Each structure stands twice: as structure tokens, then as C-alpha cells.
Amino acid sequence: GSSHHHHHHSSGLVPRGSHMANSGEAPKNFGLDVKITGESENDRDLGTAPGGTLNDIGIDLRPWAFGQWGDWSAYFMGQAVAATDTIETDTLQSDTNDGREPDKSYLAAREFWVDYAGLTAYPGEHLRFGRQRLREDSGQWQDTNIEALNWSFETTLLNAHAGVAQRFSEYRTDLDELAPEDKDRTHVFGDISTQWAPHHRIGVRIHHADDSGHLRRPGEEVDNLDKTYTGQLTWLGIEATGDAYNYRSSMPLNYWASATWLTGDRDNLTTTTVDDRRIATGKQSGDVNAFGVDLGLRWNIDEQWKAGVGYARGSGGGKDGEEQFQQTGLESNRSNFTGTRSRVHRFGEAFRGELSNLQAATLFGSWQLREDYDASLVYHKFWRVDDDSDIGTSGINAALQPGEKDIGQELDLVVTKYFKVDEPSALIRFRGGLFKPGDAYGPGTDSTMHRAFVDFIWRF
Ligand SMILES: CCCCCC[Se]CCCCCCCC(=O)OC[C@@H](O)CO
Ligand SMILES: CCCCCC[Se]CCCCCCCC(=O)OC[C@@H](O)CO
Ligand SMILES: CCCCCC[Se]CCCCCCCC(=O)OC[C@@H](O)CO
Ligand SMILES: CCCCCC[Se]CCCCCCCC(=O)OC[C@@H](O)CO
Ligand SMILES: CCCCCC[Se]CCCCCCCC(=O)OC[C@@H](O)CO
Ligand SMILES: CCCCCC[Se]CCCCCCCC(=O)OC[C@@H](O)CO
Ligand SMILES: CCCCCC[Se]CCCCCCCC(=O)OC[C@@H](O)CO
Ligand SMILES: CCCCCC[Se]CCCCCCCC(=O)OC[C@@H](O)CO
Ligand SMILES: CCCCCC[Se]CCCCCCCC(=O)OC[C@H](O)CO
Ligand SMILES: CCCCCC[Se]CCCCCCCC(=O)OC[C@H](O)CO
Ligand SMILES: CCCCCC[Se]CCCCCCCC(=O)OC[C@H](O)CO
Ligand SMILES: CCCCCC[Se]CCCCCCCC(=O)OC[C@H](O)CO
Ligand SMILES: CCCCCC[Se]CCCCCCCC(=O)OC[C@H](O)CO
Ligand SMILES: CCCCCC[Se]CCCCCCCC(=O)OC[C@H](O)CO
Ligand SMILES: CCCCCC[Se]CCCCCCCC(=O)OC[C@H](O)CO
Ligand SMILES: CCCCCC[Se]CCCCCCCC(=O)OC[C@H](O)CO
Ligand code: NA
Ligand code: NA
Ligand code: NA
Ligand code: NA
Ligand code: NA
Structure with missing residues (x-):
């Protein structure tokens, strides 16, 4: 059930x-996940800089071990990667710089945890401690492997979770340091929801991120391992879904609707450039009072075909930047929102947008056939909310032109074959995004960019 160590895996x-x-059969005490990935990426900077291109292949081996003894259990998964360049074999990977340059080949400890299920007699209730997969169904709050203590309670009528998490290491042979946004940042979070009618759920969710770290002092040189800000930030959300992420729904329509308020304060570092160097000049504190929304509707046209629409907006700009929404930093933004077994990036495989000063309109269609195939075609159009503010993270490394709201458009295709079929043990997938930059990217930029993968995944 939901406590299974691979329950949240997208495969x-x-x-x-x-x-x-x-x-x-008895529960396996070990297994091996094998992945071979090709990636083609051109050009992440839209042709405005050297590099940014990949055409490369890699293998990623993830052996795992599991033990169970009454109410106690434990789990380890490791990772070994060898590739012809630094491609993405892990949709959850840390984003990447002295101590933050990935190697083409590396080892990692992915998960390591102990679990106690004895606080209540519900097998849907358990407490997990260690580096562990955290995920909620939208992918927009948490979908990551992180050191945490997390309590889960999942029953027919009531679901609830509560946890604390913090990164202390990447546990990787090549990344020696944490990303600055992760260093000394503690997360606490929880949620509670109820199935108020069959297949319809309503819930509330909270997340708090607190930075204990400090900013560089005036006059100190500032490099890429230094923070850009420290924050005490709270996200408070309402979420309603009707089979939103359920690829086996029998309802004719599925939907999601969520609204999230972000409050708190940030201390933002200021800098100046002095002779090929960045120097701290001070900092400025200010409230955050921002808002995000994500809505979608999916038509289950028949057993095979589905189609739907989505709209999302993360506020931007505002008085002294207070309306700049941002996500937790634990999100993947990957979900089964097209109604198939495959998860898809909600804001594009190429653009990979964070809901931050961003408005997106989405159209999709999908097709699936038992547990054997699925396919999705997704269109997005993206605009800034405030044309003088940046957006958040994205898969595009290029400057936005002041005063231009047109970020661009994207077309994605995901196609999957599942192999041994009653329950598949392997798959081969094509996942690709084509991004057409809009006027916010300005002259001298490429007219299109793509990011495309073939993944072959076998579980033993
Ligand atoms: C498990 C993954 C295996 C997938 C195999 C697909 Se092969 C087609 C990839 C399509 C990639 C085309 C790019 C080739 C290129 O342009 O090479 C540079 C050239 O100018 C001279 O070096
Ligand atoms: C230092 C350079 C050496 C690397 C050479 C090996 Se390129 C491995 C293929 C990598 C390209 C795979 C990306 C997905 C894709 O483009 O598939 C197109 C196809 O499936 C549509 O029919
Ligand atoms: C840094 C972390 C510490 C390293 C070790 C923790 Se993982 C070893 C767990 C192994 C513990 C298994 C024994 C529990 C038990 O009760 O087994 C008896 C049997 O009668 C029950 O059916
Ligand atoms: C500063 C660096 C320290 C952090 C390193 C993490 Se410990 C080494 C990875 C520990 C994770 C164990 C699994 C890796 C593995 O064994 O993959 C081998 C493959 O050949 C199986 O088919
Ligand atoms: C608040 C939630 C806490 C949950 C903790 C459970 Se797991 C921690 C076990 C392992 C702890 C490892 C510490 C290693 C380290 O500090 O190395 C740093 C270096 O790699 C670069 O930062
Ligand atoms: C049961 C769960 C329900 C979740 C659904 C939340 Se719908 C939020 C309605 C959105 C209303 C917010 C108004 C924002 C605004 O003012 O737009 C900026 C404008 O000034 C410039 O274009
Ligand atoms: C069925 C259950 C009821 C569901 C209630 C959700 Se109605 C969504 C109203 C939308 C509210 C928008 C608030 C905007 C904000 O707080 O940030 C910007 C601003 O305050 C900074 O100056
Ligand atoms: C109708 C559905 C469209 C959906 C987007 C799928 Se991504 C398009 C490219 C994905 C197909 C393989 C990758 C292309 C490639 O390897 O060429 C490299 C070369 O063009 C350098 O620009
Ligand atoms: C900080 C949190 C703790 C991290 C724990 C890593 Se546990 C490594 C794999 C743990 C999985 C089981 C380990 C030992 C075992 O199972 O021996 C008994 C027998 O084989 C049962 O079948
Ligand atoms: C019963 C015990 C079973 C567990 C044995 C599996 Se090997 C340990 C891998 C999981 C533990 C993390 C190892 C990597 C690390 O600790 O690096 C931290 C950083 O480099 C320091 O600053
Ligand atoms: C089964 C054992 C479970 C017991 C542990 C309960 Se912790 C509740 C999780 C909920 C997470 C709490 C977040 C608090 C917060 O962020 O407030 C910041 C403040 O508003 C700034 O203005
Ligand atoms: C059968 C009834 C049992 C009642 C007592 C059980 Se206490 C369980 C501790 C942990 C409960 C999880 C708390 C997380 C939460 O509800 O916060 C989300 C929201 O944002 C808050 O505003
Ligand atoms: C088996 C029975 C289980 C009963 C548990 C009921 Se959980 C349903 C919560 C759904 C209630 C929505 C409350 C709306 C809210 O408080 O949001 C305010 C906003 O986030 C602040 O800015
Ligand atoms: C990127 C690709 C474009 C995505 C389309 C976006 Se919305 C289309 C959903 C709406 C489609 C539902 C209508 C199906 C129907 O009308 O059935 C036939 C008749 O009613 C007898 O039952
Ligand atoms: C690349 C994979 C996805 C392709 C995009 C699909 Se766009 C619309 C999706 C679904 C619409 C396709 C036609 C539906 C149908 O065949 O039945 C309709 C019948 O009139 C009612 O019974
Ligand atoms: C290199 C990347 C490859 C990625 C997957 C390509 Se799968 C072709 C899917 C296209 C599926 C169209 C029709 C499927 C169907 O109905 O087949 C019945 C089936 O044989 C019953 O076994
Ligand atoms: Na398994
Ligand atoms: Na198992
Ligand atoms: Na480039
Ligand atoms: Na339990
Ligand atoms: Na569906």
C-alpha cells in the first residue's frame, strides 16, 4: 500500500x-532498478552562451534493500551513474560552482530510512526517519528525496501527514557542497484532507521554510555558493481534487483546484560588481504576501482517450516585491495530470517552469491502452505576471527583457510502452519538449529550444 518503498516512484x-x-510471494528484501537514458538538449541558453547542449547517453543503477520486523522496517537505495556527459538521469536531481559541478560518473546514497508503523493499528499510518522520498500528488509542494522525519496517516475517510526535513548533504561522490538555498534551511509541513464524496477530496496544507544561515557582509566577495536571501516563509493552501491524478478514473470528468497563500519575510542580499567580481553591499528585508492558483479539468472521453485544460498563476512583483510567489524548493512540478500512468512536467519538459511571477495556460490530450501504453500531447503558453520582475527557476538560462510579458509557448510529447501485460516490470519512454521563446527573450536568441529523453527502465 502507500507505505511501500516504491509507492511514490513515477515508474x-x-x-x-x-x-x-x-x-x-513474500515481500522482496532486495532488488535492482536499472535505467538507461539518452538526452538531447539544445540550447538551454537559447544560443547566448557557450555550452548548454547535450546529446548523450548514460546508465543509472539503483540497488535497494528492505527489511521488515513486526512494526519496524528499514530501507536503503544506492545509485551508480556512468554517462557520456552530465545528463539528467533523475527527474528529482539537485540543480547545478566549486563543489557543485557534477561528474559524468558518480555514486550516491539515494534513500536510507527506518520506519515504525506501530503507533496505530492502521497500516496506512506509519512514521519514517531518514533520507526518504516525500511526495504529494500535485508534485508542487514536495516531490524529492530528503532527510526527514515524516508521519503519514492514510485511510478511506481521512488522510493526514506531518513532518520536518532538512538537507545536510547530497550524499554524492561529486557534489561536495549543498546548494545555497538548501544550506541551513529547515522545512516543517503537514496536511489533512477528507474524501467527502467518493473520489472527491478536500484538504488544507501547510509548509514552513526557515533559514538559519547568514548572508555575506558588506564588502565581502559573493560567489555561487553564497545565499541570495534568507527567508522565513509559510505556505497555506486549500486543495480540492476529483480523481485529479488518477489514471484509472471511472468518472467522466476529473479536476483539480488549489489556492495557496505565501506569507512571511525575506532578507535579500544586495551586491555590486567591482572588476569581474561581485561584492556584497548590504541587505533589504521585506514582507512576502503572495498567492498561487492551479486549476485543471480533464475529460475522460472513453476508456482510452482523455483531454483537458489547465490554468495556473503564481503572483509576481508588487510593493517592494511582496507579491512574488515562489515554491517550497522541494517540488518537482511533475504529476499525472494528463490522466495516464506517466507523470508529466506540469509546466513543460523544456521550460520546467516554477510557479513564480508566471501565468500558464495548458491544453492536453492523452491516450492509453490497459497497462500497456500511454501517450500525452501537451501545449502551454506562458506569460509573466509582472514584466519588470524575474521569474523563478526554469529550464531556460537566458535573460528576460524588461517590460515584456510574453515568455513563450511549448509543445510536449510523452509516449510510453510498458513491458513484462498485467503489471509491467519495465518500460521504454520518449519524453520531449519543444519551447518557442517569446518576446521576453529578445534578439539574438534561438527561435526554438528542445529537451528530449529516451528512458529505458527495468525493475528486478
Ligand atoms: C537510450 C537512448 C538511445 C536513443 C538513440 C537515439 Se539516436 C538519435 C538521437 C538524436 C540526436 C541528434 C543529434 C546528433 C548530432 O547533431 O550530432 C552532432 C553532429 O553534428 C556531429 O557530431
Ligand atoms: C560526447 C557525446 C557522445 C554521446 C553519443 C551518444 Se547519443 C545517445 C542518444 C541521445 C539522444 C536521445 C534523446 C531523445 C531523442 O531524441 O529520441 C529521438 C527518437 O526517439 C525519436 O524517434
Ligand atoms: C545507522 C543505523 C543503524 C544500523 C542498523 C539499522 Se538497519 C538493521 C535492522 C535489523 C534489525 C532486525 C531485527 C529486529 C527483529 O525484531 O527481528 C527479530 C525477529 O524475530 C522479528 O520477526
Ligand atoms: C563524498 C562521497 C561520499 C558519498 C558517497 C555515497 Se556512499 C557510495 C554510494 C553508496 C550507494 C550504494 C549503491 C551504489 C552502487 O552500489 O551501485 C553499484 C552498481 O554497480 C550496482 O549494480
Ligand atoms: C530536520 C530533519 C532531520 C532528519 C535527519 C534524518 Se537523516 C541524517 C543522517 C546523516 C546526516 C549526515 C550529515 C552529513 C554532512 O553534514 O555532510 C555535509 C557535506 O556532505 C556537504 O554538506
Ligand atoms: C475548493 C478549492 C478552491 C481553489 C480555487 C481558487 Se480560484 C482563485 C480565484 C482567483 C482570484 C484572485 C484575484 C487575483 C487578481 O487580482 O488578479 C490580478 C489582477 O489584478 C491582474 O490581472
Ligand atoms: C470551497 C472552499 C473555499 C475556497 C477558498 C479559496 Se477562494 C481564492 C481567493 C483568492 C485570494 C487572493 C489573495 C491575494 C494575496 O493574498 O496576495 C497578494 C496580496 O495580498 C499582496 O498585496
Ligand atoms: C508533434 C510533437 C512535438 C513535441 C515535441 C517533442 Se521534442 C522535438 C524534438 C524531439 C525529437 C528528438 C530530438 C531531436 C534531435 O535530436 O535533434 C537535435 C537537433 O534537431 C538540434 O536542434
Ligand atoms: C538514519 C536512518 C537509518 C538508515 C538505515 C539504513 Se538501513 C540499510 C538497508 C536496511 C534494510 C535491512 C537492513 C538489515 C537486514 O535486513 O538484516 C535483517 C534481515 O536480512 C531481514 O530480512
Ligand atoms: C546498517 C548500516 C547500513 C548502511 C550502509 C550503506 Se553505506 C552508507 C550510505 C548512506 C549513508 C550516507 C553516506 C555518504 C555520506 O555520509 O557523506 C556525507 C558527507 O560526504 C560528509 O560530509
Ligand atoms: C504523529 C505526530 C505528529 C505531531 C507533530 C505535529 Se507538527 C504539525 C505540522 C504542521 C507544520 C507547522 C507549521 C507552522 C508554521 O509554519 O507557522 C509559522 C508561522 O505561521 C509564521 O508566521
Ligand atoms: C481521529 C481524530 C484524531 C485527532 C487527533 C490526532 Se493528532 C495527529 C498529529 C498530526 C496531524 C497532522 C497535522 C497537520 C495539519 O493538519 O496541518 C495542515 C493545515 O495546514 C493546518 O492549518
Ligand atoms: C472523516 C472526517 C474528516 C474531517 C477532517 C476535515 Se479536513 C477538510 C479541510 C477543508 C477545509 C478548508 C478550510 C479552508 C481554510 O481554512 O483556508 C484558509 C486559507 O488557507 C488561509 O489563507
Ligand atoms: C494539445 C491537444 C489539444 C487538447 C484539447 C483540449 Se480540451 C478538449 C476536451 C473536450 C473533449 C470532450 C468532448 C468529447 C465529446 O464530446 O464526445 C463526443 C460526443 O460528446 C459523444 O459523447
Ligand atoms: C499523442 C497522444 C494524445 C493525442 C492528443 C489527443 Se487530443 C483529444 C484527445 C481525445 C480525443 C480523441 C478522440 C476521442 C474518441 O476517439 O472518441 C470520441 C467519441 O466521439 C466519443 O465516444
Ligand atoms: C524510442 C522510444 C519508444 C517509446 C514508446 C513507443 Se510505443 C508505440 C506506441 C503507439 C501505440 C499505437 C497503437 C498501440 C496499440 O494499439 O497496440 C496494441 C498492442 O499491440 C497490444 O499489445
Ligand atoms: Na518492489
Ligand atoms: Na520489498
Ligand atoms: Na549555448
Ligand atoms: Na500503523
Ligand atoms: Na483520468
Whole structure:
């Protein structure tokens, strides 16, 4: 059930001989996830800088181990990667610089945790401690592997979670340092929701991020391992879904609606450039009072075909920047929002937008056939909310022109074959995004950019 160590994995594969494959089998105490990935990426900077291009291939091996003893259990997953350049074999990976340059080949400890399920007799209730997968269904608050203590309670009528998390390391042979935004940042979070009618859920969610770190002092040189800000930030959200992320729905329509208020304060570092160097000049504090919304509707046209629409907006700008929404930093923004077994990036495989000073309109269609195939075609159009503010993270490394709201448009295609089928144990997927920059990117930029993957995944 939901406590299974692979429950949140997007692949949704089931190894041969496992208890999930045949309930008469004993739970596996070990297994191996094998992934071969090709990536083509051109050009992440839209042709405004050297590099930014990938055409490369890699293998990623993830052995895992599991033990169970009454109410106690424990889990480890490691990772070994070898690739022809530094490609993305992990949709959850740390974004990347002395101590932050990935190697083409590396080892990592991905998960390591102990779990106690004995506080209540519900097997949907358990407490997990260690580096662990945290995920909620939208992917927009948490979808990551992180050191945490997290309590889950999942039953028919009531779901609830509460946890604390903090990065202390990447646990990787190549990344020696944390990203500055992660260093000394503690997260606490929880949620509670109820299935008020069958397949309809309403809930509230909270997340708090607190920075204990400090900013560089005036006159000190500032480099890429230094923070740009320290924050005490709270996200408070309402969320309603009707089979929003359920690829097996029988309802004719599915939907999601969420609204999130972001409050708190940030201390923003200021800098100046002095002879090929960046020098701290001070800092400025200010309130954040920002808002985000994400809405979607999916038509289940028949057992195979689905289509739908989405709108999302993260506020931007405002008085002294108070309306600049931002996400938690634990999100993936990947979800099953097209109604298939495959997860898709909600704001484009190429653009990979964070909901921050961003408005997006989305159209999609999908097709699936039992547990054997699925395919999705997604269109997005993106605009800034405030044309004099930056946006947040994205898969595009290029300057925005002041005063231009047209970020661009994107077309994505995801196509998947599942192999042994009752429950597949392997898959091959094409996942690609084509991004057409709009006027906010300005002259001298490429007319289109793409990011495309082929992934072959086998679980043993
Ligand atoms: C598991 C993944 C395997 C997938 C195999 C797909 Se092969 C087609 C990839 C399509 C990539 C085309 C880019 C080729 C290129 O342009 O090479 C530079 C050239 O000018 C001279 O070096
Ligand atoms: C230092 C350079 C050496 C690397 C050479 C190996 Se390129 C491995 C293929 C990597 C390209 C795969 C990306 C996805 C894609 O473009 O598939 C197109 C196809 O499936 C549509 O029919
Ligand atoms: C840094 C972390 C510390 C390293 C070790 C923690 Se993982 C070893 C867990 C292994 C513990 C298994 C034993 C529990 C038990 O009760 O087994 C008896 C049997 O009768 C029950 O059915
Ligand atoms: C400063 C660096 C310290 C952090 C390093 C993490 Se410990 C080494 C990775 C520990 C994770 C164990 C799993 C890796 C693995 O064994 O993959 C091998 C593959 O050949 C199996 O088919
Ligand atoms: C607030 C939630 C806490 C949950 C903790 C549970 Se797991 C921590 C076990 C392991 C702790 C490892 C510490 C390693 C380290 O500090 O190395 C730094 C270096 O890699 C670069 O930062
Ligand atoms: C049951 C769960 C329900 C979740 C649904 C939330 Se719908 C939020 C309505 C959105 C209303 C917010 C108004 C924002 C605004 O003023 O737009 C800026 C304008 O000044 C410049 O274009
Ligand atoms: C069915 C259950 C009821 C669901 C209630 C959700 Se109605 C969404 C109203 C939308 C509210 C927008 C608030 C905007 C904000 O707080 O940040 C910007 C500003 O305050 C900084 O000057
Ligand atoms: C109708 C559906 C469109 C949806 C977007 C799928 Se991404 C398009 C490229 C994905 C296909 C393979 C990657 C292309 C490639 O390798 O060429 C490199 C070369 O063009 C350098 O610009
Ligand atoms: C900071 C949080 C703790 C991290 C724990 C890493 Se546990 C490594 C794999 C743990 C999975 C089981 C370990 C030992 C075992 O199972 O021996 C008993 C027998 O084989 C049962 O079948
Ligand atoms: C019963 C014990 C079973 C666990 C054995 C698995 Se090997 C340890 C991998 C998981 C533990 C993390 C290892 C990497 C690390 O600690 O690096 C921190 C940083 O480099 C320091 O600053
Ligand atoms: C089964 C054991 C569970 C017991 C642990 C309960 Se912790 C509740 C999680 C909820 C997370 C709390 C967040 C608090 C916050 O962020 O307030 C900041 C303030 O508003 C700034 O203005
Ligand atoms: C059968 C009834 C049991 C009642 C007592 C059980 Se206390 C469980 C501790 C942990 C409960 C989780 C708390 C997280 C939360 O509800 O916060 C979300 C929201 O944002 C808040 O504003
Ligand atoms: C089996 C029975 C379980 C009963 C548990 C009920 Se959980 C439903 C919560 C859904 C209630 C929505 C409350 C709206 C709200 O307080 O948001 C304010 C906004 O976020 C502040 O800015
Ligand atoms: C990027 C690709 C474009 C995405 C389309 C966006 Se919305 C289309 C959903 C609306 C489609 C639902 C209508 C199906 C229907 O009308 O069935 C036939 C008739 O009613 C007998 O039942
Ligand atoms: C690349 C994979 C996805 C392709 C994009 C699909 Se766009 C619309 C999706 C679904 C619409 C397609 C037609 C639906 C149908 O065939 O049945 C309609 C019948 O009139 C009612 O019973
Ligand atoms: C290099 C990347 C490859 C990624 C996956 C390509 Se799968 C072709 C899907 C296209 C599926 C169209 C029709 C499918 C169907 O109905 O097949 C019945 C089936 O054979 C019953 O076994
Ligand atoms: Na398994
Ligand atoms: Na298992
Ligand atoms: Na470039
Ligand atoms: Na329990
Ligand atoms: Na669906």
C-alpha cells in the first residue's frame, strides 16, 4: 500500500516475483532498478552562451534493500551513474560552482530510512526517519528525496501527514557542497484532507521554510555558493481534487483546484560588481504576501482517450516585491495530470517552469491502452505576471527583457510502452519538449529550444 518503498516512484513498475506482483510471494528484501537514458538538449541558453547542449547517453543503477520486523522496517537505495556527459538521469536531481559541478560518473546514497508503523493499528499510518522520498500528488509542494522525519496517516475517510526535513548533504561522490538555498534551511509541513464524496477530496496544507544561515557582509566577495536571501516563509493552501491524478478514473470528468497563500519575510542580499567580481553591499528585508492558483479539468472521453485544460498563476512583483510567489524548493512540478500512468512536467519538459511571477495556460490530450501504453500531447503558453520582475527557476538560462510579458509557448510529447501485460516490470519512454521563446527573450536568441529523453527502465 502507500507505505511501500516504491509507492511514490513515477515508474509504477512491479518486479517479477514480488509480493505486489503476486500476493502469495513474500515481500522482496532486495532488488535492482536499472535505467538507461539518452538526452538531447539544445540550447538551454537559447544560443547566448557557450555550452548548454547535450546529446548523450548514460546508465543509472539503483540497488535497494528492505527489511521488515513486526512494526519496524528499514530501507536503503544506492545509485551508480556512468554517462557520456552530465545528463539528467533523475527527474528529482539537485540543480547545478566549486563543489557543485557534477561528474559524468558518480555514486550516491539515494534513500536510507527506518520506519515504525506501530503507533496505530492502521497500516496506512506509519512514521519514517531518514533520507526518504516525500511526495504529494500535485508534485508542487514536495516531490524529492530528503532527510526527514515524516508521519503519514492514510485511510478511506481521512488522510493526514506531518513532518520536518532538512538537507545536510547530497550524499554524492561529486557534489561536495549543498546548494545555497538548501544550506541551513529547515522545512516543517503537514496536511489533512477528507474524501467527502467518493473520489472527491478536500484538504488544507501547510509548509514552513526557515533559514538559519547568514548572508555575506558588506564588502565581502559573493560567489555561487553564497545565499541570495534568507527567508522565513509559510505556505497555506486549500486543495480540492476529483480523481485529479488518477489514471484509472471511472468518472467522466476529473479536476483539480488549489489556492495557496505565501506569507512571511525575506532578507535579500544586495551586491555590486567591482572588476569581474561581485561584492556584497548590504541587505533589504521585506514582507512576502503572495498567492498561487492551479486549476485543471480533464475529460475522460472513453476508456482510452482523455483531454483537458489547465490554468495556473503564481503572483509576481508588487510593493517592494511582496507579491512574488515562489515554491517550497522541494517540488518537482511533475504529476499525472494528463490522466495516464506517466507523470508529466506540469509546466513543460523544456521550460520546467516554477510557479513564480508566471501565468500558464495548458491544453492536453492523452491516450492509453490497459497497462500497456500511454501517450500525452501537451501545449502551454506562458506569460509573466509582472514584466519588470524575474521569474523563478526554469529550464531556460537566458535573460528576460524588461517590460515584456510574453515568455513563450511549448509543445510536449510523452509516449510510453510498458513491458513484462498485467503489471509491467519495465518500460521504454520518449519524453520531449519543444519551447518557442517569446518576446521576453529578445534578439539574438534561438527561435526554438528542445529537451528530449529516451528512458529505458527495468525493475528486478
Ligand atoms: C537510450 C537512448 C538511445 C536513443 C538513440 C537515439 Se539516436 C538519435 C538521437 C538524436 C540526436 C541528434 C543529434 C546528433 C548530432 O547533431 O550530432 C552532432 C553532429 O553534428 C556531429 O557530431
Ligand atoms: C560526447 C557525446 C557522445 C554521446 C553519443 C551518444 Se547519443 C545517445 C542518444 C541521445 C539522444 C536521445 C534523446 C531523445 C531523442 O531524441 O529520441 C529521438 C527518437 O526517439 C525519436 O524517434
Ligand atoms: C545507522 C543505523 C543503524 C544500523 C542498523 C539499522 Se538497519 C538493521 C535492522 C535489523 C534489525 C532486525 C531485527 C529486529 C527483529 O525484531 O527481528 C527479530 C525477529 O524475530 C522479528 O520477526
Ligand atoms: C563524498 C562521497 C561520499 C558519498 C558517497 C555515497 Se556512499 C557510495 C554510494 C553508496 C550507494 C550504494 C549503491 C551504489 C552502487 O552500489 O551501485 C553499484 C552498481 O554497480 C550496482 O549494480
Ligand atoms: C530536520 C530533519 C532531520 C532528519 C535527519 C534524518 Se537523516 C541524517 C543522517 C546523516 C546526516 C549526515 C550529515 C552529513 C554532512 O553534514 O555532510 C555535509 C557535506 O556532505 C556537504 O554538506
Ligand atoms: C475548493 C478549492 C478552491 C481553489 C480555487 C481558487 Se480560484 C482563485 C480565484 C482567483 C482570484 C484572485 C484575484 C487575483 C487578481 O487580482 O488578479 C490580478 C489582477 O489584478 C491582474 O490581472
Ligand atoms: C470551497 C472552499 C473555499 C475556497 C477558498 C479559496 Se477562494 C481564492 C481567493 C483568492 C485570494 C487572493 C489573495 C491575494 C494575496 O493574498 O496576495 C497578494 C496580496 O495580498 C499582496 O498585496
Ligand atoms: C508533434 C510533437 C512535438 C513535441 C515535441 C517533442 Se521534442 C522535438 C524534438 C524531439 C525529437 C528528438 C530530438 C531531436 C534531435 O535530436 O535533434 C537535435 C537537433 O534537431 C538540434 O536542434
Ligand atoms: C538514519 C536512518 C537509518 C538508515 C538505515 C539504513 Se538501513 C540499510 C538497508 C536496511 C534494510 C535491512 C537492513 C538489515 C537486514 O535486513 O538484516 C535483517 C534481515 O536480512 C531481514 O530480512
Ligand atoms: C546498517 C548500516 C547500513 C548502511 C550502509 C550503506 Se553505506 C552508507 C550510505 C548512506 C549513508 C550516507 C553516506 C555518504 C555520506 O555520509 O557523506 C556525507 C558527507 O560526504 C560528509 O560530509
Ligand atoms: C504523529 C505526530 C505528529 C505531531 C507533530 C505535529 Se507538527 C504539525 C505540522 C504542521 C507544520 C507547522 C507549521 C507552522 C508554521 O509554519 O507557522 C509559522 C508561522 O505561521 C509564521 O508566521
Ligand atoms: C481521529 C481524530 C484524531 C485527532 C487527533 C490526532 Se493528532 C495527529 C498529529 C498530526 C496531524 C497532522 C497535522 C497537520 C495539519 O493538519 O496541518 C495542515 C493545515 O495546514 C493546518 O492549518
Ligand atoms: C472523516 C472526517 C474528516 C474531517 C477532517 C476535515 Se479536513 C477538510 C479541510 C477543508 C477545509 C478548508 C478550510 C479552508 C481554510 O481554512 O483556508 C484558509 C486559507 O488557507 C488561509 O489563507
Ligand atoms: C494539445 C491537444 C489539444 C487538447 C484539447 C483540449 Se480540451 C478538449 C476536451 C473536450 C473533449 C470532450 C468532448 C468529447 C465529446 O464530446 O464526445 C463526443 C460526443 O460528446 C459523444 O459523447
Ligand atoms: C499523442 C497522444 C494524445 C493525442 C492528443 C489527443 Se487530443 C483529444 C484527445 C481525445 C480525443 C480523441 C478522440 C476521442 C474518441 O476517439 O472518441 C470520441 C467519441 O466521439 C466519443 O465516444
Ligand atoms: C524510442 C522510444 C519508444 C517509446 C514508446 C513507443 Se510505443 C508505440 C506506441 C503507439 C501505440 C499505437 C497503437 C498501440 C496499440 O494499439 O497496440 C496494441 C498492442 O499491440 C497490444 O499489445
Ligand atoms: Na518492489
Ligand atoms: Na520489498
Ligand atoms: Na549555448
Ligand atoms: Na500503523
Ligand atoms: Na483520468
